[PDB]
């Protein structure tokens, strides 16, 4: 057994998926022949490996985002989460009130609106 993939495979596998993302299928044989044309792998046995790992990565890339390499459409959805989230447009719900000892600060700083009072019991853990 054994046969844990080396770094020479994992380095180029990531690269080949980033710049030829479109050409990929999810079949072994198709992904082999693409790697043969978009690059030269100087061995035959090495080629049969790099294809198989390119296949095995492409399975996971069709789920959530991989943390070793980037593709375009994930950076799209990244941007779409990072410019507005549907949760709020209001700040925060527009009116939030506070309890005393905060009101005393506001009293001495010329503010006197939009408050509630509750004088919660003593004390820490008690």
């Amino acid at each position: 057994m054994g046969r844990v993939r080396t770094k020479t495979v994992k380095k180029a596998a990531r690269v080949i998926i980033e710049k030829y993302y479109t050409r990929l299928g999810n079949d072994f044989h198709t992904n082999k022949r693409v790697c043969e044309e978009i690059a030269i792998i100087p061995s035959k046995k090495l080629r049969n490996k790099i294809a198989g790992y390119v296949t095995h990565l492409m399975k996971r890339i069709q789920r959530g985002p991989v943390r070793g390499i980037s593709i375009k459409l994930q950076e799209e959805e990244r941007e779409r989460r990072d410019n507005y989230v549907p949760e709020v447009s209001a700040l925060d719900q527009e009116i939030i009130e506070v309890d005393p000892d905060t009101k005393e600060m506001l009293k001495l700083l010329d503010f006197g609106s939009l408050s509630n009072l509750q004088v919660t019991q003593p004390t820490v853990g008690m």
């Binding site: 700040l91 925060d92 719900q93 009116i95 939030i96 506070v98 905060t102 600060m105 506001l106 700083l109 010329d110 503010f111 939009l114 820490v124």
Partner: peptide
């Protein structure tokens, strides 16, 4: 100097509170 407006934002975001 600080306006009346910004006071609401400070208090709604709970900035005034600080740890034990």
């Amino acid at each position: 100097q600080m306006k009346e407006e910004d006071v609401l934002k400070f208090l709604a975001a709970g900035t005034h509170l600080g740890g034990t």
